[PDB]
Design a protein around this nucleic acid. Structure first.
Length: 53
RNA sequence: UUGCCUUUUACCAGAACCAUCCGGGUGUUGUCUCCAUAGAAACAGGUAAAGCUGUAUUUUUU
């Protein structure tokens, strides 16, 4: 239980950090604000995944 | 924060703080260079020259 719980919490944290980041990236893309091609691709992928979820 | 852009340096152009630099005086010393060398004169007043003032009949002194 405890170890598992801790792991869960950290993955939640990661998600929070990740999802927010993705959102930010998307916003940037929408604007037209020096997005990296690779970064944009990642955002597209990540965002797609999020949508699916 | 923008822009070219999509990787970065190297860049666009604005902002705010900051620094660096190329320079600048001023003052005081110290030096370097070039020219130079006197340790005592005013008072009594003259001689000469420079600074300023002047040109008795009701309110100044006739």
């Amino acid at each position: 239980a405890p170890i598992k719980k801790i792991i869960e919490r950290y993955i939640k944290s990661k998600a929070d950090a990740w999802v927010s980041a993705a959102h930010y990236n998307r916003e940037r893309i929408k604007r037209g604000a020096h997005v990296e091609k690779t970064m944009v691709k990642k955002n597209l992928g990540r965002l797609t995944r999020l949508w699916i979820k």
